[PDB]
Amino acid sequence: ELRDQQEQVKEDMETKCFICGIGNDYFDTVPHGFETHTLQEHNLANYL
Amino acid sequence: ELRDQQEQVKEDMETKCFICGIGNDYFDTVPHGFETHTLQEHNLANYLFFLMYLINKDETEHTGQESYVWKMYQERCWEFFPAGDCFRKQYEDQLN
Amino acid sequence: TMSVLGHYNNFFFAAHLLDIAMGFKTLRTILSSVTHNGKQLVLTVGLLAVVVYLYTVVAFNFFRKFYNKSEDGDTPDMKCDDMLTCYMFHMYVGVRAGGGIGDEIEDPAGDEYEIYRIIFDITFFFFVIVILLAIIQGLIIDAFG
Amino acid sequence: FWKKIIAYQQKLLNYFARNFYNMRMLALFVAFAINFILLFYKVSTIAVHYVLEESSGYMEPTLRILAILHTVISFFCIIGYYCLKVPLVIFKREKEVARKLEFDGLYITEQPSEDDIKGQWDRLVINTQSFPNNYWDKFVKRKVMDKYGEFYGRDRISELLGMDKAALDFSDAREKKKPKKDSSLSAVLNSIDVKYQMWKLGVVFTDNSFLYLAWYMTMSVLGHYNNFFFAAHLLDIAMGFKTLRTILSSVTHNGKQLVLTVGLLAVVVYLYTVVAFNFFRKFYNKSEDGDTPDMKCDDMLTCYMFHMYVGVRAGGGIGDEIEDPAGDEYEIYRIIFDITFFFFVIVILLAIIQGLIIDAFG
Amino acid sequence: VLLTNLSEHMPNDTRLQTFLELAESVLNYFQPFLGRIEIMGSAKRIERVYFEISESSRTQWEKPQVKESKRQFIFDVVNEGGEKEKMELFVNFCEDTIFEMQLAAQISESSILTVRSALFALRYNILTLMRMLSLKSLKKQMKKVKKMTVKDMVTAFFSSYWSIFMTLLHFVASVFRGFFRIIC
Ligand SMILES: Nc1ncnc2c1ncn2[C@@H]1O[C@H](COP(=O)(O)OP(=O)(O)OP(=O)(O)O)[C@@H](O)[C@H]1O
Ligand SMILES: Nc1ncnc2c1ncn2[C@@H]1O[C@H](COP(=O)(O)OP(=O)(O)OP(=O)(O)O)[C@@H](O)[C@H]1O
Ligand SMILES: [Zn+2]
Ligand SMILES: [Zn+2]
């Protein structure tokens, strides 16, 4: 169960944005779109 | 955990293309589309053979595309690799 | 009825402690591990009984001389002269033993059936003690998962 | 006459094929009854002879009748198998060989690997006239004709497949047919295809399930000479019950890894035996009488047998069975020896086996 | 390469189709040696590139060791990897594999008995079973069973399968004897 919980956390944070919740593929229509969105536009550290 | 990792590897390689990353269903709109795309258009062995041929080919004899890829590879920029796009998606309307 | 009989014999009140399974849901979650695969748990015991019966057949036909269980040399307590007694021995003592039937039967050292008996004991330990009990534990863990 | 006997034969075959499974269940039930009767023998006092002791006195005739019935049902289960399940095997084999002949040319272009029993044995059925006897496609020999005739020689392909050009020319040409009777038994003997039946018998003999049923019948027959041979029939429960098969799948799923685990355990125990034989040979005395010492590690084979039998079956390891190393100049080394033996052999490897079974379940 | 480029960039062209049929043989010959990839071109468009794959390169790629290396690389890049460095790890693996295949090409310069025994036993034992009918000497038996009885009928029916099971037992014993002789 601990392993499954860790894997679920990793999958969620890799497949959907923390703030808006939009999936990764929509941003990935532009190359590196998900990384750009989650590290420049909707970064939680930026909100903090 | 080892079994789960093996299953995850199999599922990823069966559901999405290695290079572009587009899902299997989009190609599967055409019969055998995913297999055709992953074995003829975006085959990783084909990219390996292209790098081999470009390395073993003389620089003066390079064509325009080969020179472009050669410069990009020398500068270690991997933008020439298709990411999120393919020939089918780029020529969707004209091809069909 | 149990409560009424408890007046005649006060120890009949101990049966009421079996109500904790229904009393507590958290204990029901634990018991679900056993009850989830109960049919397979019973079939595992049936298969174990068949395997032990086969071993009893082999021992009764070939290794009957190593089942003396008496220290006094005057009176020998042979436990495999009877098929039912040999099966009871194998199912009780051999199964409950940590090392198998060889932990309880006589040493085969310096015997013309030494190799066959050693194979007998090793196979008993591997198939019965190791594999089948592991099957039971795996059933419980699989029920949890 | 001929029609009546053929009809009666067909009735018998149909009955056996219909009741094949019920007879297979009945054989198991009779096996459980016989083995329950066998549980009440006594050894009587040299020449020792096995008697059935009972207060009733009937259960010896019960045992005889049950053994005869079990043998008869075992024979009938072979007959029912041959009438019911054999045709499916022949159909599958004829389909496979036909597809290999057509779409692979396994006897025209390339040849069998000479290590394939099926590929070598299937060369006989091609030349037979009764080919697709069970497979529906009766034009496979003409498809091979039309595919490989021009390239590899039409007459050569015809010789391979057994077709006769003169036969077809004779059929097309003008002749006068002469009547024949099925009543002519010499004619029917000439009509039967010896080669095709030989290939069919070979396929049946190479079939695994038919071999299992033959072993069952042989076991049942030997049970008359020795009544305890009927205990081997209790091994049929795995095939009898699917629920028991689900349990056994846990063991059989990782059988290769389970065997390799035992091999690794044997190697580890051999290494420990080497160490003990070279350094700790004085602690392996196994006799209480001080006059005669029963050294168990003076011989390499004896030491290995000791370590594999007693040390492995012991709950604490070899140290539970070898002499206490207290007050010895090799005390620390021997204690490390025992602890490592207990940890690696008793704890880890057995846990590997259990984990294999649980992983198979999952 | 020219014809393939034209065919792929002009999909629905009946005029080009006929030339494709006329050049079918050459295209079939050169199919293994023709490479095809897609890249993000300088004109901000996806472009297909056609190159030459060598026969030696193909063989060294299909060697089992390179396939195991490919499987390990895929496992690693999938389980522990990121989208940023995926295409860097892939190029590193490609370079290492290319060097190893070139070195392999450089250095690379220049039971049946059991099956036969089983086949022989199977032929011999079944021929023994069929001899009773191949000799065509069953006339005396037919003479003794002119009298048609349902009991004799059923007895012969069972006897056929009994003879089959002796033939199978004999074949199995012969196989075991042959295997023991071969191993010893
Ligand atoms: N709103 C978000 N803000 C930040 N990261 C997000 C957000 N939504 C999704 N992500 C994803 O979460 C991941 C963040 O990575 P991670 O937390 O491991 O970063 P790190 O600071 O490098 O961590 P580590 O301590 O392991 O070095 C990325 O894959 C990123 O795409
Ligand atoms: N870019 C890609 N290149 C190649 N295969 C890809 C790619 N993307 C996805 N795939 C998929 O990965 C799988 C490749 O199969 P695999 O690696 O087992 O091939 P193989 O050479 O036959 O392997 P094996 O050594 O097991 O015989 C296919 O299902 C294919 O669709
Ligand atoms: Zn967002
Ligand atoms: Zn792709």
Numbering used by the authors:
A (entry chain A): 4872 to 4919
B (entry chain B): 4872 to 4967
C (entry chain D): 4727 to 4871
D (entry chain C): 4480 to 4524, 4555 to 4871
E (entry chain B): 4100 to 4209, 4237 to 4310
What's written in the study?
We also present the cryo-EM structures of the PKA-phosphorylated human CPVT-linked RyR2-R420Q and RyR2-R420W under conditions that resemble those present during diastole and show that both mutant channels are in the primed state and that the Rycal drug ARM210 stabilizes the closed state of the mutant channels. Moreover, by analyzing two different mutations at the same residue, we were able to determine whether the identity of the mutant residue differentially affects the local and global structures. Recombinant human isoforms of the PKA-phosphorylated CPVT-linked RyR2-R420Q and RyR2-R420W channels were expressed in HEK-293 cells and purified as previously described. Treatment with the Rycal drug ARM210 partially reversed these movements, reaching a conformation closer to that of the closed state of WT RyR2. Treatment with ARM210 reduced the RMSD values by 0.18 (n = 4, SD = 0.025, p = 0.0004) for the three CPVT channels and the HF channel analyzed, strongly confirming a common inhibitory mechanism. Similarly to RyR2-R2474S10, we detected an increased density in the cleft of the RY1&2 domain of RyR2-R420Q, RyR2-R420W treated with ARM210, where Rycals were shown to bind. We also detected an increased density in between the BSol1 and RY1&2 domains. This suggests that binding of ARM210 to the RY1&2 domain affects the local structure and stabilizes the interaction with the BSol1 domain, which in turn stabilizes the upward-inward conformation of the cytoplasmic shell associated with a stable closed pore of the channel in agreement with our previous reports. As expected, we found that the primed state exhibited weakened affinity for calstabin-2 (50-100% increase in Kd caused by increased koff) and treatment with ARM210, which reverses the primed state, increased the affinity of calstabin-2 to RyR2.
Ryanodine receptor type 2 (RyR2), an intracellular Ca2+ release channel located on the sarcoplasmic reticulum (SR) of cardiomyocytes, is essential for cardiac muscle excitation-contraction coupling. Structurally, RyR2 is a 2.3 MDa homotetramer consisting of two functional regions: a massive cytoplasmic region, also known as the cytoplasmic shell, which comprises several regulatory domains (NTDs, NSol, SPRYs, RYs, JSol, and BSol domains) and the stabilizing subunit calstabin-2, and an activation core and pore region, which comprises the Ca2+ binding site and the transmembrane domains. Dysregulation of Ca2+ handling, characterized by aberrant SR Ca2+ leak, is a pivotal pathophysiological mechanism in a spectrum of cardiac disorders, including heart failure (HF), atrial fibrillation, catecholaminergic polymorphic ventricular tachycardia (CPVT), and other arrhythmogenic disorders. Here, we solved the cryogenic electron microscopy structures of ryanodine receptor 2 variants linked either to heart failure or inherited sudden cardiac death.
